[PDB]
Design a protein around this ligand. Sequence first.
Ligand code: HEM
Ligand code: 5YG
Ligand code: BR
Ligand code: BR
Ligand code: BR
Ligand code: K
Ligand code: K
Length: 396
Amino acid sequence: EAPDVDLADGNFYASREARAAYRWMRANQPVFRDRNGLAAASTYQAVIDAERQPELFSNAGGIRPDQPALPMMIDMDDPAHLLRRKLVNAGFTRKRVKDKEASIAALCDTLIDAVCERGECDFVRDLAAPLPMAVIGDMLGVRPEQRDMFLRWSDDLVTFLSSHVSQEDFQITMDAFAAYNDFTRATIAARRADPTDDLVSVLVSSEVDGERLSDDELVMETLLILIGGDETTRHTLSGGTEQLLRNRDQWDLLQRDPSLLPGAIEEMLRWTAPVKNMCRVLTADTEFHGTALCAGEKMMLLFESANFDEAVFCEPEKFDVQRNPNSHLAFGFGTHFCLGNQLARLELSLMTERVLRRLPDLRLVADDSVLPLRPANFVSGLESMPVVFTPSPPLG
Ligand code: HEM
Ligand SMILES: COc1ccc(CNc2ccc(Cc3ccncc3)cc2)cc1
Ligand SMILES: [Br-]
Ligand SMILES: [Br-]
Ligand SMILES: [Br-]
Ligand SMILES: [K+]
Ligand SMILES: [K+]
């Protein structure tokens, strides 16, 4: 019998029974319909095949199950999407991202300095959540003492994307957007008159095919970047480190061999899959991997399910930092492949290498059976992760 599940319900993704439900879907109905008839691609093959057919599986209806499209690149199809992405790509060239290494490392060291003397911290609150916020906030010109405000707006907006909000939460969402809009339009006006090397400056000057980003587009695209920056990577940092601590042979391998870190980051991404789904709207009736789909309905791409697909990943419930190949779909695939992937990987690398070296005897206070995941239908990971370690003095 099929699992009785609602794939638009955030409680499904907070359940540690989700992977059992995905396993059934992959073995019995790869393009699954949930208890409300919502279609979802559960196998790696079905996700890739949909990703590769953007004219049939469109982003232009919006990437959430019951919300309309917003005027931003992730809700656009080519050719318009390609121009928008090329414009925003000025902020994400390989050289610009790699050049952030020293500054990101400094933030990692400041955050570890704040807890290293204590011998205990909440890995989520004190390391995983603040590092990506500080990096993206610095790119956007946010004063350090205002990071919490931007993180609050980001939580409001990602909660809106992660659920079907009440009217009161709709109002909060609109208020947060209005505050972000006000701040960002001030930055745009200032950078136009006195350009710097910050993200808004680089985006203002970007030109492709004789076109530039409008103020409207700058607000929307930088907001997409803010929330990608501050709502996703945190969950790979916490949940990926959790797996290193649960399987101490994996922690020990990384401690003794820094050259294993790139493969470890990939396995942390495969395992944690912070983005649980993105939607595609059907542009025509189609028979897709055994399931009839109707023009105008949305189908979810279940990235965590694909990342645990035994047809692609041998023994997928084994966390193995050495896994090769590791062609996971945490960042998706195709036209919309995460623009921030290099930045996210760099943050994960720099914080993890410092955690391994500076907190070398790190351990979990209590095991996973009592560590909850955030209820959310879109992006999710650990709420809290208390950890202990031998104290050390700060680097300063
Ligand atoms: C581990 C962290 C992250 C994960 C798992 C992640 C995941 C994703 C996924 C699944 C998509 C859609 C791909 C698809 O549907 O095939 C996406 C798109 C995108 N992401 Fe991320 N993301 C992360 C971090 C970031 C960061 C840090 C940024 C920016 C600084 C960012 C910016 C974007 C943008 C702009 C898009 C839209 C690309 C397009 O539509 O062409 N993401 N991301
Ligand atoms: C109601 O007005 C608005 C306006 C803007 C937004 C924010 N749009 C948005 C933000 C974040 C993501 C998640 C994500 C980003 C990058 N990589 C991976 C995941 C998707 C869409 C919401 C509501
Ligand atoms: Br299949
Ligand atoms: Br479009
Ligand atoms: Br920048
Ligand atoms: K505020
Ligand atoms: K397994």
